[PDB]
Structures are given as structure tokens and as C-alpha cells.
From Swiss-Prot, chains A, D, F:
Superkingdom: Viruses
UniProt name for this protein: Hemagglutinin HA1 chain
Residue intervals on the Extracellular side: 1-322
Encoding gene per record: HA
UniProt-annotated glycosylation sites, renumbered to this chain: 10-11, 23, 87, 287
Disulfide bonds: 42-275, 55-67, 90-136, 279-303
Length: 322, 82, 171, 322, 171, 322, 171, 82, 82
């Protein structure tokens, strides 16, 4: 009679690497590396992302006429730019501190747009209707940004304007405006009458004065002129004051911002779909409890640690020897 | 058929409730256990899958014998309907 | 490999023993069969699960991390940013691939250890009431029916009882 | 007769974690994690820290009248701001490159303040005594910064001034000054007479020209005007030259800086006490040789590595089995 | 647990042996008592101290590290800064908690090893002049007074001397 | 008869450290730490580095007259500054965004310099020959940068100039220019005639307007005046337009840039030699396949990981016991 | 030290055995000599090479990394940059020095294990056809010429053949 | 009493001077050793505390038997005054 | 002499070609093997050097016995010319 000691083996083909040998077959193991995704863009916390499409952040917030789909947008879980987000500033010029603005936005989860200076009642002494350009066509007509108002001379005069806004929305307000720089002195006169015009803007934190830089530059979208775009976050209770004797592209709509965490801007050409996920990447969503992923370093939500590895399988059972 | 067997197996997995979270807190993990069930006939392999399933989801080790008990009921039930 | 048992003096596993990681094959007059050792197995599992949880829980699930943009005059900060990202990534990749490698060695050796300790557990219980073949097998110098077997697995085998009987046959 | 092998056990209750099991009782162990501090702010190298109290760095260096306790300060081991450090610039305006200045200061261990341009003898052609404001009251009277001198018109004229300083102190000198921007043209005239005034400042490294930006802004501390504050580090042997036809708030006192390492600015509401330590944090000092601490990531001196852990105990003895 | 000795074939420790980590319990006609093995203990300690020093000395005491401030238009650099700080912290926390965990396993196993090697050290010295009970005990087949004991602890036990005497009693 | 088991030992003196003991002698081991270098600066990919010598990047690109050796330079594997690279801007002033420019250059592996605005034919209405200074002497004569052209008044007039360049080189072009700021109004008149002069420069991306800041500053290299230097990368197909009524130091030569990776600027006083290496550091080259090096944290090419360690020897054989 | 063999029950190495890491010293009537065990050695080497490759290949050769310059108003970013560089360096230095330390322990223990397993490999083959001296030596109870030796090294030693012959001499 | 016993024990600890730093270089470590002394009666536990105390402070391993000798003098002395 | 012995030993090392890269892809590693050859008389030490030389250069483990074969030819040849 006899008794023997022994250990389990099975038909398992799982292999793992160890420090002394590679490609070792074991009886059980666990994969620690998620390497699969669903190729779509999904909701998070059940909120759909904002797909900007052909517009970019600048084009969105100014209301480039090419961006009318975005006019109704108010909450999103994150923001998606694509390879074709080319509609931004349609009138050529610099958008000042643009990268910082995007950063601010990476932590805004929703907002309420509102009419800061109603076109019809705020500007009784200035022209509000000739401020369109072939540079911002829409339906083949000269048109303009939906969130800004281009003021020009009435008859043959541009009197000094002074307009202030007090923030009673209970949260930060994003205010955008522009400063126009005609290419010639005679053009300056045609639009604003005054050669020595300036724009001054002030609140508790922002305080800047701008003057027109008139000069010939190469034409961009047919325009030898330029327009600069500026923005500020008006703190609760704060006031913003605009003063100008010309060249001001005044705010029309502004944005009361709701802050969140875990929001962000991603760039992806993957289709948005109605699925829901806890972790989103630019290639597609991940539905995983694995500690690691090698899908993408950019993630929104709660995700596995990104690593370059192609394989992380930890043996749990023993060397498999049938 | 599976439609009915699937609904029952899932109800049970939730009811196991190893962490006192309520039967509805384990819906994700329960599907993973159901899937794993159709992939084997060995109570031991299955007992191992479950424990792993629940350790990733919850960062908490389930007593082996407790897990092992659940697996036995499920494979008995799989065979009983098949 | 460290403890000489798995793929050592016990050359092979039992595709046939499906209820546990370690166990026994018994042959007496009353019949054969395979039996896993719950205690050995139970201990190994609580151990391995804990090894794995410690590894997973140490890993911060990664919360939102997205790119920053920089203008064409922010090339230095842009590169600093990239240096940061890649450096952390070289590291997490490195610790992770290396950790798994090292831990896999230890896990497998852990199993070797469990088996060896099980063999020698049995060996010390039986003593001269059996001889060691040298392949994880013991030959009895007495009849050991299934009742006797059970005592051996669950730890309560009685040596004195058979020491006499075994002493006669052996010499 | 018999002999047995065995191992020590005792009544030790210390537990440690291992990779295979938690809460294991061992016979001896060492804690590697300091998790206790003395709740006070202490000296380092026997030098007391500088407690700014209600002032902040800006308020200190300009000599906000609310900061007179700091007037006598010259060496410190580190600087302490509190939750109430609100006295900074009492005349509203921007302090230019303020964060950088704080960074410079984080490596200054001491200084000698001195009278760069003595009020009584440097400015024979200008008014030095009407440059006070209700915005910087002190004892209910209009007053002003102790380190700056507000020059105004004498009678009805502000002649062009030109004043230079050569650095013979053998070390870097911190020079501060301001530029004033009245809210109206008529106010400009009242103070400085000249509508077209400018301020120009130059040394080997700094070179800037400023002109007044006159405009209405919301009132801050009663003031619709603004004042900008500037600073520079004048290198050894270098000269600084101020030129102005108005609007200059001239340096009065400046600072010859002594550099050290291991200094810093911390923010803490913990009481300063007379104890001495090797390692200071914002919660309190640590007197430890342990390699780790979980008290605070901000430290001055020589400290244990901060980690988020609540427990790091390394077994030294064996599993305790009585 | 790896070597089967501590909490294995020697089931328990001796709350009674206070002068060392490993040692002996002896019973002869001349009296009992407990005796620690300095060499085994001395070796284990130099070992563990070194394990601990290497861990501590690798750790740069942390010299001055303080926050930076950034203005409301330096939000990107501000976040870059924070990403740096937290990332290094995830890492130092992770290496540290994990290092201690792994090292604790090794330390305890180190002790198991020391004990086992001590048992088998004695076993190889005595040979057939005693039998193994199987619980860290040996029974002598001859009278071993306290003089004989000392030789055993300090390594110089003489087998031939008692091999004859022991051969008679045993059979 | 007898048989014994045993293990190898030899006369090896190699020691390694382990966690339980230091200075352990083993039978075989490998060093993982390269700690030796050849003390020279070498080629990479067989391309010699650019040794700037007494000039620095600014001095090189402007063509400081002290830098004529660099005039013929066109490709390099990396750039070497020394402890004596002091010849930069010889006319005192600020080189704007200089650190960024160096960063751009750290990824340029070669270029073709060319005559953007030929001195002899581009400027028929302006003086090109009186624009020399004792501040940039060369051979004891007033001289000037080789890559820039200092335009001044012809007779007693400086008419408005307007000059544009279109980029047809198929790659980015680095354009440099300057803006001059005389110290006095009368000096302004002597050089440019016009008191109210300006310089305006524009392309698709760059757009700036400069005006002269006339004021006395301390003399530097005999000069109370200042000159500012500016640069831009003109993208393919883009145009740059200069307009000025004074004070412009116009581009003469510019650089079409060839990008590479793995280039860089290092500072070293080690001699350049004709050897070839795969890995270069500021102390000397490394010819190694070891994973680590403790020679220097700055490297060009493919290098071992820098670590502070003095010893990393991994035992391969066993404890050596003869 | 863990397995008790190297610098343990086999007190010393053989400066004389130059063709391998582990092996045999044999003495019979027909002559002495030293012989390395290729299989034991071959296995240890593939093992150690792999341990070393995994360590090296995980290490990104360092591609171009050069300093950045910052102006006298970029002191914060300058310090952020330096904080990044030094932090990664503390880490790579720390992982590296510590990794080698830990791995060296494991490598040496690996060798101890290989030797012990070799001893016990031989011990289980011979059984009572020889006695254990206790110093890595076995004494035969029968004549074992060089032919017999070879069978032992390459694993094929025949016990039954000599079990009778050995049984007589021994008792 | 302790006042006198405390001063003497401290003088000695400094005088032990394991690293050739002078008796006054160890004042911090000496208090830690004194404290540890009143916490035990086992020379072995105490020998362990000391070595640890000095390893953290100085990053240097004290010979065990040397430490063990110091502890024996101190516990003999503690009992001798108590 | 070495001049001729050096050229031949080098030709061979390249020809060994363990990774199917052509004889000319190993010029650096071959010198390292040549150098190592003049530093020992034990085939085993040398077999160890080679394998290490090639593992650093190529991140790939050469079969021990294959390496061991090359070393034997080279030391036989070194002695044969000396
Ligand atoms: C929203 O984004 C879309 C693209 O994503 C953008 O559409 C573009 O409009 C521009 C601007 O007019 C188009 O550019 C022109 O293309 C034609 C033919 O291809 C050229 O002839 C034009 O250049 C001529 O004139 C230039 C100026 O003087 C000269 O420099 C040049 O040499 C030519 O003479 C000009 O390049 C562009 O083709 C479209 N693209 C598409 C695909 O529609 C649209 O403008 C954006 N809308 C807004 C309002 O933001
Ligand atoms: C040193 O710091 C202390 C605080 O830490 C600071 O004390 C503050 O002084 C200000 C400035 O005058 C006080 O603010 C006022 O509070 C009263 C009543 O609370 C308000 O009526 C005032 O606002 C009126 O006027 C404003 C301007 O037109 C209007 O906009 C407003 O709607 C009101 O009509 C004003 O807010 C403040 O209360 C004190 N705080 C304390 C606790 O003392 C002191 O000024 C600093 N000193 C210096 C010189 O730096
Ligand atoms: C190329 O770089 C070299 C150095 O690497 C540089 O050479 C330097 O030229 C300067 C500028 O003229 C020299 O500086 C002078 O040195 C003399 C005597 O040492 C001093 O008298 C001069 O200062 C006087 O005038 C100053 C201005 O008013 C006063 O402030 C001062 O107090 C004195 O009265 C002045 O400092 C310098 O010595 C040389 N150095 C060397 C070693 O040659 C050369 O100019 C660079 N060339 C170019 C064109 O880039
Ligand atoms: C692992 O070995 C298997 C066969 O057992 C083979 O299919 C696979 O390609 C091997 N992998 C590697 C990379 O060695
Ligand atoms: C450790 O077990 C002890 C009792 O032995 C108990 O007091 C303590 O709460 C346990 N800790 C954890 C978190 O398991
Ligand atoms: C290592 O010991 C050797 C002598 O065996 C000695 O030369 C060397 O200095 C020792 N190193 C250290 C730092 O202990």
C-alpha cells in the first residue's frame, strides 16, 4: 500500500514571465492590464460630452457664425475637439491668453449664457448694424460673431462711451471683447471717425488700455486689418467698466460658469455614442477594474494607470505540469 | 432556458452581498460571475474567478470557503438545468 | 524551483486532482482516489489574494489627467511638461513590469514551499511506518484502510498503534 | 533525556503587515513613520522666524503703515504668513512680478535696510509732504508707505527730475518704486501739473518707461485712481537711474540682501514659540530621525520624507507565538 | 512559513527564553533551563540592522521644499507644478508602503530559515545518538549531562564517544 | 569509498553589497555602472559639433564681428558653449525671447544662411554705410553685425520704408532684426531725422509695433543708447513685412532651418577632438552598453541612465569561499 | 545562507573545480578528480542571465536630455524644472541602488538553493547504499568504480543492483 | 533617586562614544537610551533599542555584542538603585 | 604573433553571428571578446564573459552551451599559438 503527495495541473495555456525565465506556463493567473476599449465617446455621470465638431474653443465662445449648433449648449461632461476644429477667429487677429482660457474651461462643467449688454437698449448713441464682414460670412452674407457686437460711428461721429456691468450672478462670469486695428488712417476715419481713439477696460483685477495700431499687413481672409480678442473672469460682486472712443468690439453675451472637477478637453475623431462609461479616453471608453491600461495616457474620469506595457499577467496558480 | 436561468443566477449573486452593500450594489460583478459560470465545470476554477472578480471591484478579500460555497451552488444549478 | 519539490522530486502534476492546489493520491486494498488538502490550499489562497490586493490598492486609480496646450513661445514650459509626463511614465511602466516579474518568481516559489512542507508534514507523521520512494511517495509497512488515510490528511494519524505491526513487516 | 530547538516569544502586541497577510503580531519592530509634531513654530539654527502677522510680503517691503512692527526686522530663519495677512498694497493697483519677488525672498536669510534717497536732501525742487492718502490711514490720518516717497508738484510746477543710485553695498540691492495713474486729466493737473508726464527707469538689466493711464475705474478704498508697484535687484556695482516728469513714487528705503539656502515662506496659523528644532512644518515642528513623516509636505530644514501613509512598521523580530 | 519551522514543525515560541531570538530547552537528570544561541542570534541581528540601514540611508532626508505661488494667469504652470508634486508623492508613498510590505515578508522568512538551519545543525551533529520526535525535539539514547549539552550548543559535540553506548540502548 | 557535493570558488576579489551584508566577496559579477569617460568632445553620427568658442548663441546668429569663424558654419551634431562665450550683443540692449530662441535651436541640426534683403539693391532711398559703432569694433575700427544692416537718414531725410519677404525656401526661416533707441532727441535727429518714428513688423503670426524710447541710461561699452533684438520663425509660404519711419536695424542674412532630434546645446571646456562616439556628455564621451552612468546628467545621443551612485555591481556567481 | 548549504553544511568551495558552478569530488579505488554538473550549472546560468536582461532592458537608454535656460524673471519655472530633475534622479538612483541590493540577496540565495537541491538529489538516489557524513559527503558501503560514478552524476544510478551487496557491509 | 541616576546614566551613554565623536555629540540619542531603560527589564530588548536608536541617528551599525555589554551595565545599575 | 592571431580571432567572433545580423554587425562586441580572451585561461570564465558581453550589447540571451563551445575554440587557439 502507498500514499503520494502531488500538485494540481490542468490544460491551462496561460503563460507568465518571471525574473529567471520567460513564457512560463501556470495553472491560474490574472491579467492586470486592460488593453481593450469600445472605440466610442460616451457619457460620464450620465452627462453627454460637448462635441465641438468643426469649431474650436475660440470659435465656440465668440460665437463664430459657423458654430450655431453650439448656441444652445449649457452642460457637458467634457469637451471634444476633432481634427477638423478649424473655425475659431474668422476675423484675423490674436486671441490673447487663449491657452489659459482653455485651462480655465478644463474645470467648467456647465454654464448659463446671458445677455450682458442688450444690443437694443445699451448703446443709444452708437451704430450697431454695419458691423459685419465678408471675413465672417454665413450663408454667403457678411455676418459676425453671435456673442460680440461691433460698434461703429453713427452718421459721422463716435462719442466717448462708458458702460459698466455689475456681477450679481453669484459666480464667476467670463466676459469676452475685442479691439480693432484698421490697416489705414482713412479706414479708421470711415469706421470710427477718430484718429486718436482708445479702449480702456477695468474691473477690480483686470485693468488695460489699448490703442489702435494702424498699418498694412498681408491680407488674411481678404482683410489687411486685424482684431484682438480678450477675456476676463469677473469675480462675484465685481464690476467691469468699458470706456472707448473707438475700435471696441463690445461684449453681447457672457457666461456664468459652474465649476466641476474631472472635466477636460480632449481631441478625438471617435464617434460620440449614447453609451455610458466611468472612464473615457480619446480612443474609446474603458469599462474596467484592472489597475493598469495601455490604451491611452489621456483619460477623463476614473481610470487604470496608463503604462507602455503590452503584457502584465501575474501568476496565481503554480507551474502547470501535466 | 438561459433567459430565466440568467435572471435567477444574477438575483442570487447580488443577494450573496459579501460586503453588506445591498443586493443591487453588485450588478457589474454579478455579470462577470455569470459569464465565468458558462466557461467552466470545476467548482474550484469558478471559486477562483469569483474571488478575483470581487477583489478587483472592491479591494477586499472574500473568505475562500465562503466563495467556494457560492460556486458549488451555481455549478450544481447549471448542471441541474443542463 | 527553490524548494526542489515542484518540477523537482515530485516531477509532475495531476491533471486528475481538480478540487485543490495540493493534495494526495492514495492506494490501498480498499480503492484509490485523489484528495486536495483544504488547509494547505486555503492558506495559499488567502496568501495570494492578499499579495494581489496590496499590489492593486496601492495603485491610485488615475483620475482626470489631460494635456495642456502651450503657444509657440512657450516651448520651454511645453518641453518641461513633456519631460514630467514621460518621466513618470517611464517609472510607472518600469515599476509595474519589474514588480510583476519579481512577484511572479516569489509566487511560484511560494507554491514550491507549500508542497514541500506538505510532503515533510506527512513524512514526519508516518516515520518508520513507511519508506520514502523519493518521488513524493511513501510505501506502507502495514495495511492502511480508508479510515487510516483520513487521519493522515487531517493530521491525526496514530503512529504507536501501528508501530508494532509495522516493525514486524519492515524488518 | 531530551533537547529541543525553539524560538523566542514575548507579550509584545506590535503588529505589522506583510504581502501575504495583514495585522501580523511580531516580537520586535521599528516604526519608520513619524506622525507626531509639537504644534508650534520654532527657531532653526537658533534664528527665530519672521512672523508677518496681518501683513503680507508686499505690505512688509513697501512699509504699509499697518506693518510698523516689521520695521525693525533684519534676520529670520524663514517667513510666516497667516490666514489674516491682508495688509499689502493699501493704495489700489498691481504689484508687478509679485510672485517672482516672493521666490527671490524664499532664499534671503537676512538684510540691511538703508536710506537710498534721503527724503530731506535728495529732492530740492519737488514737494515731498502732501503725498498721503486716506487709502493708507494710520491712526485715522492720511498716511503712506514707510519705504516709499510720493513726490508731487511744488507750487504749480513739476520739473524733470533725474536721480541715480550706485550700488556699493557689495551685494544685491532690492529697489522698489511705483507709478501713479490718476483717474482724470484735471486730477493729473492738480497733482503733477503735466498732462504728458512719463517715468523712465534704467540700470544695466532693468530698462522700462511708463506713462500714466488716466481713466475712471470703480473706487477701491475710496480711490478711483491706481498705483503700480515695481521692483528690481540691483546687482553689485550697478547703477539705477530714475527719470520722470510726473507720477513717480520714488524709493526711500531699499534692502541689501543676504542670501541663504533653506529659507522659505510658509503659511501657518500655529503660534510661534521659543523652542528650537531641526525640522519645521506648517502644523508644528518635528524632532525626528525617522526616514518618513506623514505630517505635512511643506517643510523647512532637514526633514523625513513626506508620504501619505498612516503606518510603516518594519518587523525586526519574528512572528510572536506564546 | 516558507521553511516550515516557525509556526510549523516547531509550533510555538518560548515566552520563557529572554536572552535571544533562537535557542535550546534542555532536560537531563541534572536539571533543566533555557539557552539562546548567540551565533544564530548575532548573525540574524547584524543582518536585520543592515537590511534596515540600507532602507533609511537611501532616503534623502528631505531638505527645504516649499510651495510656489502663481497668479491667476499662471494656471497652467500652477497645474504643472501640482502634477509634479503629487506624482512624486504617489511614487514615494507607493514605493515605501510596498517596500515595507515586501521586506516584512522576507524578514519573517529569514527568521524561519535561521531556526530551521539551527534545528538541522543540531540534527546533523547528533545523528543516531538521538531520535527526532518531530516538534523540534530530539530524545537521547544516552545520558547527556550539562557538560555534554554545552558541547552541543557551541558546536563541538563528540559522536564517536557515545556512539557505542548509544547503539546498545537504542536497539 | 566516498562522493562529495561542493561549489566553485576562485581567487576572485570582486565584492558586492547585499541587503543583509556589505562588501561580500563573490566568484563572478557584472558592473552595471559606467564611471569612465574619454574627456574629449566628439562627433555623433559622424557630424562634428559646433564649437562657438568665445561667442554665444546671440553673438553667432547676429554675426557679432568677433564671430567670423562661425560665418561658414552650416551643420553640426550639437552646439558647444564654453566658459568664455561672452561675445553676444556688442551694442547694449535686450535680446527679446532669447531663452526660447535657444530652445528652438536645440532641435535644429543644420541650416542654410541666405541674403534675405541684399544690401546693394533693397534700399535705394536709405543710407546703409554709416551704421557702424565703436561698440562693435573689429580690427580697431567701428564695425557692425554681419547679419544685420543699420539703416540711417540719407542727406537729411528718412522716408517711410516698406519691405516684405515671401518664404519660398520650403521650411521655417529664422529672421532677426533690431529696434534702436537713441539716448537723446537731438541724437535721434542726427541719425533718423524724425522725432515721431516707429517700426512695425508683421507676418501671419508675428505682429508688433515698436516706438523709440529716448532717455539717458548709464553708458555701456561707451554707449548711452540701447538696441533691442527680435526674431521670428517665418513659416513656409508666409510673408514678413517691415515698415518703419526710423530706428530699424533691418535683416540682412536669415536662416532656413533643418530640424533634427537629438541635437542640443551644451556648455563644456573640454577639447573637441576627431573621435566618434554614440553618447556625449559635457565631461567627455562614453562608449558603453552599461545601463547606468554616474558621469553627468547632461547627455547628447544614446546614453546610460545617469544616477548619483558610485557602485552598482550585481553578483552573478556565488559567495567565494576558498 | 537561507538554505544552509553554501557556507553552511558544505563549509567551503573548491578552488580546484574550474569547469562549473556546482559539482562533485569523487574518491574510489580507481582514482580521484573533480566534475561540474552541467545541468545544475546550465539551469543557474540561463536563470541569472535572464535576471540580468530584465533589469537592463527595462532601462530606457537615456536619449537626449539637456538643460533649459531661464531668465532672471523665470526663477519659479527655473526651480520647478530643477525640482523635476532632481526628483526623478533621487528616484532612479534609489530604485537602482536598492534593486541591486535586493537582487544580490536573491541571487546568492538562488545559488544556495541550487547546491542544496543537488546534495539532496544525490542523497535520494543513493539512500542506504551510503551514509551521510554531514559535510556534503556520502560514504559508500560498496565499491563504486568510475562507471558507477557517471551514472550518479547524470542521474541514472541503480540502487537495487547494489542494495544486497551494500546491505551486507553496512550491518 | 532619578535626578542623580539620570545624570550618571547620561554621562555614560555619551562616554560610550561608538563613533569617536566625543561624549557630547550623542546628547539626543542618550536621552532616547535613558527613556528606553525605564521601559524594560530584559537586557536583550534594551540592547535592541539602543542599536536602533544609534542606527537611525547615525546610519551606522553598532556591533551587537558591544551594544549588549552597555545594556547589561545599565540594567544592572537600574536594579542596583532599585 | 598577435597581429595575425588578433585578426583571425576577430574574423571568427563576427562569424559566430548568434543573431543572424551578418559578420560585420558585431565589431564592437568582438573586440571586447578578444580582450577578455587574453585575461584568462579558464573556458568557463571566458564563456561567462562572452555571454555577458552579448547580453549587454543586444539584450538577448545566448544559449550557455553555444557560448561555451566558442570559448573552447578560442582558448585552444590561444594556447596553440602560445
Ligand atoms: C470655417 O472653416 C472653414 C474651413 O475649415 C473655412 O473655409 C475656408 O474659407 C477660406 C477663406 O476664404 C478658404 O480659403 C480660400 O481658398 C480659395 C480657393 O481654395 C483661395 O483662392 C483663397 O486664397 C486666395 O486669396 C488669398 C487672399 O488674398 C490669396 O493669398 C491666395 O493666394 C488666393 O488668391 C483662399 O485661400 C478655404 O478654401 C475654405 N476652406 C474650406 C474647405 O471651406 C471657413 O472660412 C471658416 N468660416 C468661418 C467664417 O470661420
Ligand atoms: C489692513 O487690513 C485691514 C483688514 O484686514 C483693512 O481693514 C479694512 O478697511 C477697509 C477699507 O476702508 C474696510 O472696508 C469698508 O467696510 C465698510 C463697512 O464694513 C464699508 O462700508 C466700505 O465699503 C463702502 O464703500 C465702498 C467704496 O465705495 C462701497 O463699494 C461699499 O459698497 C460701501 O459703500 C468698505 O467696504 C474694511 O471693513 C476693513 N476691515 C477691517 C476688519 O478692519 C485695513 O484697511 C488695512 N489697512 C491698510 C492701510 O492697509
Ligand atoms: C568680445 O568679448 C570680449 C571679452 O570677452 C570683449 O572685450 C572687452 O571689451 C570691453 C569693452 O570696451 C572692455 O571693457 C573695458 O575695460 C577697460 C580696462 O579694463 C575699462 O577702462 C573700461 O571701462 C571704462 O569705461 C567704462 C564706461 O564708461 C566705465 O564705466 C569704467 O569705469 C571705465 O572708465 C571697460 O570696462 C574689456 O576689458 C574687454 N575684455 C577683454 C578681456 O578683452 C569684447 O568687447 C567683445 N567684443 C565684441 C565687439 O562683442
Ligand atoms: C512561448 O512559447 C509558445 C509555445 O509554447 C510560443 O507559441 C510563443 O511564441 C512563445 N513566446 C515567446 C515570445 O517566446
Ligand atoms: C488587528 O487585529 C486586532 C486584534 O488582534 C484588532 O484589534 C485590530 O482591529 C485588527 N486590525 C485590522 C484593521 O484588521
Ligand atoms: C571591504 O573589505 C576589504 C578587505 O577585505 C577592504 O579593503 C575594504 O576597505 C572594505 N570596504 C568597506 C568600505 O568596508
Amino acid at each position: 500500500d502507498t500514499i503520494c503527495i502531488g500538485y494540481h495541473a490542468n490544460n491551462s495555456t496561460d503563460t507568465v514571465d518571471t525574473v529567471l525565465e520567460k513564457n512560463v506556463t501556470v495553472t491560474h493567473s490574472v491579467n492586470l492590464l486592460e488593453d481593450s476599449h469600445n472605440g466610442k465617446l460616451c457619457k460620464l455621470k450620465g452627462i453627454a460630452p460637448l462635441q465641438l465638431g468643426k469649431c474650436n474653443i475660440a470659435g465656440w465662445l465668440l460665437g463664430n457664425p459657423e458654430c450655431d449648433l453650439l448656441l444652445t449648449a449649457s452642460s457637458w461632461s467634457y469637451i471634444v475637439e476633432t481634427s477638423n476644429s478649424e473655425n475659431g477667429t474668422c476675423y484675423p487677429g490674436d486671441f490673447i491668453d487663449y491657452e489659459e482660457l482653455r485651462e480655465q474651461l478644463s474645470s467648467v462643467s456647465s454654464f448659463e449664457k446671458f445677455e450682458i449688454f442688450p444690443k437694443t437698449s445699451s448703446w443709444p448713441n452708437h451704430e450697431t448694424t454695419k458691423g459685419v464682414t465678408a471675413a465672417c460670412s454665413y450663408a454667403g452674407a457678411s455676418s459676425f460673431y453671435r456673442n460680440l457686437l461691433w460698434l461703429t460711428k453713427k452718421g459721422s461721429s463716435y462719442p466717448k462711451l462708458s458702460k459698466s456691468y455689475v456681477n450679481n450672478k453669484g459666480k464667476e462670469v467670463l466676459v469676452l471683447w475685442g479691439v480693432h486695428h484698421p490697416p489705414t488712417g482713412t479706414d479708421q476715419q470711415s469706421l470710427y471717425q477718430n484718429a486718436d481713439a482708445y479702449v480702456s477696460v477695468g474691473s477690480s483685477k483686470y485693468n488695460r488700455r489699448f490703442t489702435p495700431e494702424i498699418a498694412a499687413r498681408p491680407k488674411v481672409r481678404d482683410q489687411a486689418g486685424r482684431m484682438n480678442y480678450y477675456w476676463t473672469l469677473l469675480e462675484p460682486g465685481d464690476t467691469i467698466t468699458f470706456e472707448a472712443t473707438g475700435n471696441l468690439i463690445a461684449p453681447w453675451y457672457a457666461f456664468a460658469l459652474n465649476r466641476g472637477s474631472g472635466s477636460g478637453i480632449i481631441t478625438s475623431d471617435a464617434p460620440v455614442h449614447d453609451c455610458n462609461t466611468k472612464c473615457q479616453t480619446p480612443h474609446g471608453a474603458i469599462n474596467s477594474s484592472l489597475p493598469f491600461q495601455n490604451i491611452h495616457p489621456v483619460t477623463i474620469g476614473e481610470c487604470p494607470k496608463y503604462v507602455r506595457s503590452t503584457k502584465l499577467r501575474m501568476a496565481t496558480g503554480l507551474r502547470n505540469i501535466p | 432556458d438561459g433567459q430565466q436561468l440568467n435572471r435567477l443566477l444574477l438575483e442570487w449573486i447580488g443577494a450573496w452581498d459579501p460586503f453588506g452593500l445591498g443586493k443591487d450594489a453588485y450588478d457589474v460583478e454579478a455579470e462577470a460571475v455569470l459569464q465565468a459560470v458558462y466557461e467552466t465545470e470545476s467548482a474550484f476554477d469558478l471559486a477562483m474567478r469569483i474571488m478575483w472578480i470581487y477583489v478587483f471591484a472592491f479591494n477586499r478579500p472574500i473568505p475562500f470557503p465562503h466563495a467556494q460555497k457560492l460556486a458549488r451552488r451555481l455549478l450544481e444549478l447549471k448542471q441541474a438545468a443542463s | 524551483g527553490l524548494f526542489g519539490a515542484i518540477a523537482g522530486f515530485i516531477e509532475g502534476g495531476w491533471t486528475g486532482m481538480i478540487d485543490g492546489w495540493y493534495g494526495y493520491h492514495h492506494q490501498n486494498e480498499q480503492g484509490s482516489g485523489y484528495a486536495a488538502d483544504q488547509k494547505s490550499t486555503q492558506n495559499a489562497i488567502d496568501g495570494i489574494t492578499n499579495k494581489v490586493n496590496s499590489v492593486i490598492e496601492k495603485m491610485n486609480t488615475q483620475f482626470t489627467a489631460v494635456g495642456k496646450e502651450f503657444n509657440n513661445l512657450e516651448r520651454r514650459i511645453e518641453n518641461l511638461n513633456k519631460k514630467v509626463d514621460d518621466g513618470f511614465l517611464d517609472i510607472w511602466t518600469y515599476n509595474a513590469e519589474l514588480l510583476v516579474l519579481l512577484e511572479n518568481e516569489r509566487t511560484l516559489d511560494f507554491h514550491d514551499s507549500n508542497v514541500r512542507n506538505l510532503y515533510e508534514k506527512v513524512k514526519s507523521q508516518l516515520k518508520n511506518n513507511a519508506k520514502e520512494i523519493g518521488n513524493g511517495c511513501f510505501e506502507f509497512y502495514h495495511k492502511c484502510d480508508d479510515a487510516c488515510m483520513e487521519s493522515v490528511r487531517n493530521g491525526t494519524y496514530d503512529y504507536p498503534k501501528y508501530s508494532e505491526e509495522s516493525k514486524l513487516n519492515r524488518e
